[PDB]
Write a protein that binds this ligand. Sequence first.
Ligand SMILES: CC(=O)N[C@@H]1[C@@H](O)[C@H](O[C@@H]2O[C@H](CO[C@]3(C(=O)O)C[C@H](O)[C@@H](NC(C)=O)[C@H]([C@H](O)[C@H](O)CO)O3)[C@H](O)[C@H](O)[C@H]2O)[C@@H](CO)O[C@H]1O
Ligand SMILES: *[C@@H]1O[C@H](CO)[C@@H](O[C@@H]2O[C@H](CO)[C@@H](O)[C@H](O)[C@H]2NC(C)=O)[C@H](O)[C@H]1NC(C)=O
Ligand SMILES: *[C@@H]1O[C@H](CO)[C@@H](O[C@@H]2O[C@H](CO)[C@@H](O)[C@H](O)[C@H]2NC(C)=O)[C@H](O)[C@H]1NC(C)=O
Ligand SMILES: *[C@@H]1O[C@H](CO)[C@@H](O[C@@H]2O[C@H](CO)[C@@H](O)[C@H](O)[C@H]2NC(C)=O)[C@H](O)[C@H]1NC(C)=O
Ligand code: SIA
Ligand code: NAG
Lengths: 322, 322, 322, 175, 175, 175
Amino acid sequence: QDQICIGYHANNSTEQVDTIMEKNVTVTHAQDILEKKHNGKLCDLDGVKPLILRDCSVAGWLLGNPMCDEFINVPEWSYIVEKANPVNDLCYPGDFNDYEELKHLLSRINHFEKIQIIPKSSWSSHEASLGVSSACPYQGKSSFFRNVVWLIKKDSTYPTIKRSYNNTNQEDLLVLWGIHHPNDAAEQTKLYQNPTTYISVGTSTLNQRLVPRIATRSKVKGLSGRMEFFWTILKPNDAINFESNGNFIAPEYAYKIVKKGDSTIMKSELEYGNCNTKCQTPMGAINSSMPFHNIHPLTIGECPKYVKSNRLVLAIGLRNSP
Amino acid sequence: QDQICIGYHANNSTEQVDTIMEKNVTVTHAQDILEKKHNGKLCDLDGVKPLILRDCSVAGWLLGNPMCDEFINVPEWSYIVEKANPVNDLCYPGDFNDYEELKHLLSRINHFEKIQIIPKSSWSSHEASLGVSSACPYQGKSSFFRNVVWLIKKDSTYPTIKRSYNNTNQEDLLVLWGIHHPNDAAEQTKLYQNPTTYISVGTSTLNQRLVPRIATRSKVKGLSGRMEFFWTILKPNDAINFESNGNFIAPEYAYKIVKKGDSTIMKSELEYGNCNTKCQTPMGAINSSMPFHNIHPLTIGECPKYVKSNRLVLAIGLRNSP
Amino acid sequence: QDQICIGYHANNSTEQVDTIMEKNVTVTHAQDILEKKHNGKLCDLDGVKPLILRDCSVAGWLLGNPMCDEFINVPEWSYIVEKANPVNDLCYPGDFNDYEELKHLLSRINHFEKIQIIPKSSWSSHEASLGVSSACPYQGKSSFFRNVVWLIKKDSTYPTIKRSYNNTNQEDLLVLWGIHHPNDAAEQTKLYQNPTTYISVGTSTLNQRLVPRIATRSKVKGLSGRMEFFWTILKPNDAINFESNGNFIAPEYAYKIVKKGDSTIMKSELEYGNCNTKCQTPMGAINSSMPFHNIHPLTIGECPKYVKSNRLVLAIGLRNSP
Amino acid sequence: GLFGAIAGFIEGGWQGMVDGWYGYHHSNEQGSGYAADKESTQKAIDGVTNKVNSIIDKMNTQFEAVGREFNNLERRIENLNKKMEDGFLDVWTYNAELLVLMENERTLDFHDSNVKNLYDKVRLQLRDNAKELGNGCFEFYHKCDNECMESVRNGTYDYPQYSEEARLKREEISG
Amino acid sequence: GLFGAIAGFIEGGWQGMVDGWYGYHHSNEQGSGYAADKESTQKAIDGVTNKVNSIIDKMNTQFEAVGREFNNLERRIENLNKKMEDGFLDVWTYNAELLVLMENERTLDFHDSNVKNLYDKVRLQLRDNAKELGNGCFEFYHKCDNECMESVRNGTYDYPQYSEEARLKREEISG
Amino acid sequence: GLFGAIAGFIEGGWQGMVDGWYGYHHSNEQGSGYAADKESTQKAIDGVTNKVNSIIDKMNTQFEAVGREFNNLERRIENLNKKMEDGFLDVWTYNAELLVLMENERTLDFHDSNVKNLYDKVRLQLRDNAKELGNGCFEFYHKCDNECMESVRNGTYDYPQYSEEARLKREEISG
Ligand SMILES: CC(=O)N[C@@H]1[C@@H](O)[C@H](O[C@@H]2O[C@H](CO[C@]3(C(=O)O)C[C@H](O)[C@@H](NC(C)=O)[C@H]([C@H](O)[C@H](O)CO)O3)[C@H](O)[C@H](O)[C@H]2O)[C@@H](CO)O[C@H]1O
Ligand SMILES: *[C@@H]1O[C@H](CO)[C@@H](O[C@@H]2O[C@H](CO)[C@@H](O)[C@H](O)[C@H]2NC(C)=O)[C@H](O)[C@H]1NC(C)=O
Ligand SMILES: *[C@@H]1O[C@H](CO)[C@@H](O[C@@H]2O[C@H](CO)[C@@H](O)[C@H](O)[C@H]2NC(C)=O)[C@H](O)[C@H]1NC(C)=O
Ligand SMILES: *[C@@H]1O[C@H](CO)[C@@H](O[C@@H]2O[C@H](CO)[C@@H](O)[C@H](O)[C@H]2NC(C)=O)[C@H](O)[C@H]1NC(C)=O
Ligand SMILES: CC(=O)N[C@H]1[C@H]([C@H](O)[C@H](O)CO)O[C@@](O)(C(=O)O)C[C@@H]1O
Ligand SMILES: *[C@@H]1O[C@H](CO)[C@@H](O)[C@H](O)[C@H]1NC(C)=O
């Protein structure tokens, strides 16, 4: 006899789906909404390559720590990559004042260009060549940071330095200088001559006056002295004025800076991988369209929402009990 | 052959609605859940009018920058409106210590009243009338902030100031003072007489000792000197004690303060509009009941949730296909 | 003639449930998803008891404020409980530098042990026994913080202190010291002999130079002088070097510290209640499995989500109308 | 639709019925016209209204002040703020959009369902006294005047009273 | 209801049935009583239980410590924290409230649907051996003793076995 | 299921139908085979696809940079950040998981509903020309060749054309 029957599609698929009321419902077709894959590489971010510091910290790179690879004129970058614990930071032990705010400022840069601000050859009343340390070796020789000059007394005198630089460039200038804190009065006398000493720095905005702190300290790299660095942004057509009695670590090179946006410093052990993304992770980039991911919390770019889940499977087809 | 039929309402409406499974479904009636309209005005917030600083900054208004409008005393406000870049800030160049915390503190005030704390006429050993600058013009003449006094040596002497004020009022007192950092030793001698100088300020809680910093600085408004301002809250029945050798910018007026709640500083170019609201935006107020809006992120008051959406239309009626 | 009927369960229950379309629908059985109950007690958190300071502040407990209960050695804790306004804080008035960061650091501690770093008996050129105040009463009499030593001139001299301590323990060392700010020059001369004075402290990381501030101040407990305290973490095999001319409040006891996780300081008026939890509230612990609660915002531990609601009732059974 | 009613067998809405959401059309000897089922309709209105009101009222609103109070040496904090604001904006946007979609779907399906349920109610009243045409209409085998049809709506249709007349008309048309 | 069962044609619950959620009432010669369908009922219990448990278990909880650690010269930061806590409070409250409403609706409709499905199951078993009264009850055209009715429940009703007897009563009670 | 179709009376899927989601099987004289209803199926595909796409596209994504920029005397701020990130993680996880659950339920019920609606469509076409077996199958009382069955699917079944033949078979089938 004749029949007409109504029914629905089925197949051999094993795609499973969960439901508010039921678990592990086999289904005809399914789509995961959760991104789990990354390329294990460090890539450009929206067409702009990152500043990859290898075994160099930001401080070590900016002051030119001799052991850091030689100045990569990268004129532009979208984020900065540092290793967890970079080997080449401050070769001479010490500190960087407002360091983290500086790193954040530099994290994304539209234009960067190192320029000579005060030639080394221009210190005629002071020694500019003896400011060298075994803790800062360049090739078995005692050297020093390359962008900044350790001035020392000439003969047995350190006359007062008064030096000014007017930013005639068209861009902000990042200027860096430092002060040396010795171990005792004897060393103070030996390096600079004057016993009581200062560095004043003035801008349209900056009103600074640094005094060295003598204190007995533990040796780091065999050294008890310390170097403390400072920085400003000098606006176009402003000048910066240095006056100092000694312990001055003078600028030589500064940086033209153009800043348009902000990112952060990524801590990652990876290497550049000649690609591009909209979303970078320290474990690799994400080629994304999915609204969620479970790769890693520490992302930079236009990324899907981080979630604690291994699976977000939408049912599209129908129950496929067979 | 008579008939009885079942059916549903229809009309000529073109109200559309989206659905999880279908887009642009014409429907009989709909209700938008998203607020998109504002009145383009600055209003009271829950009955309390805002402190509208015109081309004055908070610092400019508190110290009485001569170029800021003098107005009748606003004794109470719910929030503060500043322009993005106010023209009258610190007429003499310099800084306000802990400025943003002060602005936050002042953002909503229950009671505010300026009172004279130390009369100008009371500085008999010092000049109180020459503390005047072309960078602070009042009526074509060199003037100074109105609420604070720039003391200068009288004849050729600046005897030590020791002055104290006991808060016999019933409210906290906002007290403001300052220090002047000159350009060189000569100016230091010309203005105050003493070469090495200080300002100490003590409270039940404050233990301050300020020393001027001489440094060579760029001119701002033609000036290389700087003025740095400080402040405290003096509790009822506490006293404040000033001692100073020079470079003291003394209080004259202080403020009775009653604080009960907090808001923020709104940056807006608008003007007062004699209205009231529960939710104020820098583009205008929101008359709200809707749970969502898309006006502007920077709101003050009881506001709906900010959202990136042009449309949140709930279907109420039924499919209205033709 | 016979019947077969289909129907559903009913009972006398009055459990009500709300619905997107309907309110107060009586129902057969229901389950609340919102936790509202707490035990009114302070409990261990995941097996670790809290450090309960009674009428003592963290500063008062660390420096050994004489009026605080005698240091019972709690070697480990999961969080710290303070009363809203503890009565025994700094017995001699003043300040703790970076205090909140110190409290946060101490909020959860894996190992804590007080040790003697510099014996009192070891100050042979200075008085170590007269550093005593009526504001710090102990065993009848004028005393001082117990962990720290107020050094005073011996005969009429205060020779320069240079003292160093090498952390030969295997754990970080929390070291505390202080500086005394007097009321005038006379007092400066009376206590220490030298008029112009300093304290320098040096580590592998710390480079500090403190100067006392003379200023006229309000009496707090009858005293105008102030005491300001400082601290570091000394790493294993690092040393700390103190040099000072006067106004030095020297370490005596320091603390071995092992930190593995973080919590916070709970403000609560409750007492220990010999229990255990995964979620502690200042009103009491929560025995939880429910995903939401309405007890109190300020929780420590693995807690359900805080919500503004009195009721979250899921329908499980069916409509149970009359 | 989920319930094959609204855009299924009843292929269209009646502009003639304006006094409700769901109801009836009839044509007899005495004339043709519309009536509206005031029970299914008002229940539906209460439902949908409650839905809207509850999407609106569950929202907790508290006083907040926002807010650009951090200076140019506090840009890390400022960035923390930005990430938070942005975060909430994404959350609320996604949730509000999806909520609207989902609940709109539910609402149209609810209408579908109400229509279908009215249909089946009438269908169970009439049984074989009338033929299902398959367009939401029932062709009567007997004579149904105004009083009879109001009894169909009212839920008070007397099936045996017409069963015979219908029974007669029934076997006829079949050849 | 969505499925017109629970408050539709079966206009009321039985306090007499206490051993399940859905089931049967019967009245024959041998007596009247209640029985409960243990299959539809236990499946429903499993479903709802799973729903509750999953609204509960999907919540991630991790250690947090909160927290008033900023001083009076850090009120901007303190305000940032306030905005954050308040934000999450709003999100969680709105979400929890709406989730409860939505799922409660789904639950009641699930019950409705289960009931309706049991009804249609029986209906398909009996066909014309019984009449649908329209209250969830079937008036038998034949004689259904305890064994017969337990066969209705069990899904083991022998339709042809009574079809004739029924046919007589029908085509005699429809007489 | 909600609509008692998919795992209700049609107890099982056809591996034989591979060209759609819902459709027909037939057996006559000329042979047996499968056909697929391309209308209900494509409408379903459009619906589900739209659902997925809208769960995906409603998500706002904007640039963020995260982010460990605070030092060891800024651990209170660091903790504020932690609480924020953890907060969002919890929000998003709970929402995503529950959304998937809920919408998956809705999807399977959508399938159920489509199947049921196709069934009733056919059922309304055939009436008493065929018997409902109760497994989603209709045993024809007349002769339905390929052209006839294609007319059942197409929605073009000529009921009166076979009503008599059917009426006969129906008759001979009883006594
Ligand atoms: C020489 C002498 O003893 N001076 C007497 C005044 O000090 C005294 O005025 C009273 O001052 C009291 C302060 O006494 C203390 C204290 O804290 O108890 C006394 C302490 O022994 C001393 N400790 C040390 C190491 O010097 C301490 C210390 O100098 C200050 O705290 C430093 O700032 O001073 C107290 O404030 C009373 O309120 C006040 O009456 C008067 C009256 O006795 O006579 C003087 O002889
Ligand atoms: C940096 O150098 C430029 C150029 O010399 C200075 O700008 C000039 O300032 C003078 C002095 O009053 C003006 O009269 C000129 O009109 C300025 N020229 C330009 C291009 O503006 C500038 O002031 C210098 N900066 C400082 C702080 O010394
Ligand atoms: C500020 O002035 C008040 C008013 O005289 C001072 O308070 C009085 O102190 C004396 C003791 O010298 C007592 O007799 C009174 O009871 C006090 N009045 C009150 C209301 O406390 C107060 O000490 C002064 N504050 C300071 C810091 O000098
Ligand atoms: C603290 O004292 C210890 C023990 O004397 C010092 O540790 C040793 O230092 C010497 C060099 O000075 C080495 O030869 C040893 O191998 C070190 N031991 C270890 C385990 O590190 C330590 O240098 C002193 N610290 C300071 C800062 O002076
Ligand atoms: C009180 C006083 O003597 N003010 C004089 C100052 C000060 O010398 C400097 O501002 C100090 O930095 O310089 C002026 O040119 C000015 O500002 O108008 C003249 C002015 O009368
Ligand atoms: C709504 O529910 C609450 C709790 O049962 C009850 O107090 C109140 O009376 C109810 N409102 C109505 C409509 O009666």
